[PDB]
Design a binder for this molecule. Structure first.
Ligand SMILES: CC(=O)N[C@H]1[C@H]2O[C@@](C(=O)O)(C[C@@H]1O)O[C@@H]2[C@H](O)CO
Length: 485
């Protein structure tokens, strides 16, 4: 029993733990949020994680019951206390599928909300993903590949075609199997079933055990008769009613480079270009262990099709989580985490198709492993200039000393990528410098206030794992944030 929160232990998600905030004010004034619902403590995948979603209809002041738009059912969703001793803390659920690391984006022209998450097959996370796309080509077309249970481990002789029908690719003929819009498996039109797993500890032993509860068998599960290639996928659903209902699951990572180990989202929000030649383009940040590290996916047709862009030729596989802001002419500036001990910035003057080399951002102190950041546009001038805001920790030694910065944009007299300069004029301290501060997401609320949803602890530290109710929500008026310390 415990003593502000959107997601919390005992809410409708049935998770005791959350990480990875996303916060987005919609054009209508509705405000939405999403996070990982991390059931098996605060571990990254491999684990049991669902994506939670919540909505405010009073301008982001109060919040409704969360829902779970992206969820798997192979393992039960329940409230469990994860152990925090020196042995048990390291224990992770081994055999569950998961959705991890959300991105929210609105297309303001169509009023469609998109929710993206990484989609991890059972027992997979980024660190143990196999190299490959997960797709094969049958006569020039890309289809999701499948492994049948009685074939050799390395053999994916089956494909999900545009039908939903599973085909044998050696004979090119349709099987009796198919998937529905959630990638659940059917034979002869009958739902195929498997037993759901529970998870319970005995001392520091984690027991993952079948129950008697039947669930839909899914190609992402450990127990399935057909199974996907064990790499990372990008999932998306869209909503035309501000998150009351969602579309079928879309696997959008058809473009995943064959040489990549993982290709995942930079969590937070995406961006729709407001100004210039590429107004209307939807763009979402990504990163990879591949030919490239930073990347993006964009759509010019309101979300139906997505093009992958590599932003560099970095083979590091660092956690290059990025967020994007727009300059007054429509050019883009992306701020990113790196594995080099600074936040980097890259620019694009062609709507995100090409990007400048990284420039360190000197104003902010970070660790060698880095932390996600949040950057947003602000709709009103500050000190007569277009303004952006940035939220991140400010410390070389841990994730702590959270700040909200305000950056004012000027023309430099130069051209191209050098057209604009940002003066980080204002720096507001969220709390005492010692207080933990990890991932965060900013949004501009419909009254011009700034909302912040953030991890109020150090989510890297091996000594702060599995803390409950650390995702805190605060609201500020802009005058409060205008502090020059
Ligand atoms: C897909 C995935 O695993 N994303 C993770 C990664 O970023 C975080 C992090 O806190 O830094 C949390 C994210 O949910 O931890 C991971 C890091 O790569 C090494 O721990």
């Amino acid at each position: 029993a415990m003593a502000s929160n959107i997601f919390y232990a005992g809410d409708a998600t049935k998770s005791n733990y959350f990480r990875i905030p996303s916060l987005l004010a919609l054009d209508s004034g509705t405000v939405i949020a999403a996070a990982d619902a991390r059931y098996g403590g605060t571990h990254d995948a491999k684990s049991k994680i669902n994506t939670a979603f919540a909505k405010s209809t009073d301008g982001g002041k109060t919040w409704g019951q969360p829902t779970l738009p992206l969820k798997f059912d192979d393992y039960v969703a329940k409230n469990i206390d994860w152990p925090r001793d020196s042995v048990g803390k390291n224990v992770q659920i081994q055999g569950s599928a998961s959705y991890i690391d959300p991105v929210l984006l609105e297309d303001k022209e169509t009023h469609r909300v998109f929710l993206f998450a990484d989609m991890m097959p059972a027992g997979i996370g980024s660190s143990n993903a196999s190299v490959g796309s997960g797709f094969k080509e049958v006569d020039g077309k890309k289809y999701l590949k499948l492994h049948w249970k009685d074939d050799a481990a390395g053999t994916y002789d089956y494909s999900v075609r545009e039908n939903g029908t599973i085909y044998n690719d050696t004979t090119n003929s349709a099987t009796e199997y198919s998937v529905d819009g959630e990638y659940n498996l059917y034979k002869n039109g009958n739902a195929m079933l498997c037993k759901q797993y529970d998870y319970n500890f005995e001392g520091t032993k984690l027991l993952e055990t079948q129950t008697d509860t039947d669930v839909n068998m899914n190609v992402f599960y450990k127990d399935a008769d057909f199974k996907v290639f064990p790499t990372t996928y990008l999932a998306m659903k869209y909503s035309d009613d501000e998150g009351e209902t969602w579309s079928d699951l879309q696997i959008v990572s058809t473009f995943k480079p064959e040489e990549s180990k993982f290709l995942v989202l930079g969590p937070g929000v995406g961006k729709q270009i407001a100004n210039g030649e590429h107004a209307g383009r939807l763009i979402v940040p990504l990163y990879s262990k591949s030919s490239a590290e930073l990347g993006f996916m964009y759509s010019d047709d309101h979300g139906n099709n997505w093009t992958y862009v590599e932003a560099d030729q970095n083979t590091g596989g660092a956690t290059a989580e990025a967020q994007i802001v727009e300059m007054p002419d429509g050019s883009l500036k992306t701020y990113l985490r790196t594995g080099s001990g600074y936040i980097a910035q890259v620019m694009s003057t062609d709507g995100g198709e090409t990007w400048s080399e990284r420039v360190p951002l000197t104003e902010i102190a970070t660790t060698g492993y880095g932390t996600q950041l949040s950057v947003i546009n602000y709709s009103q001038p500050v000190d007569g200039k277009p303004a952006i805001l940035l939220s991140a920790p400010n410390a070389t030694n841990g994730r702590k000393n959270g700040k909200i910065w305000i950056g004012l944009i000027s023309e430099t007299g130069n051209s191209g990528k050098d057209k604009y300069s940002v003066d980080w004029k204002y720096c507001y301290s969220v709390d005492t410098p010692q207080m933990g501060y990890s991932y965060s997401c900013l949004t501009e609320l419909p009254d011009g206030e700034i909302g912040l949803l953030y991890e109020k602890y150090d989510s890297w530290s091996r000594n702060e794992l599995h803390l409950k109710n650390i995702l805190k929500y605060e609201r500020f008026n802009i005058d409060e944030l205008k502090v020059q310390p």
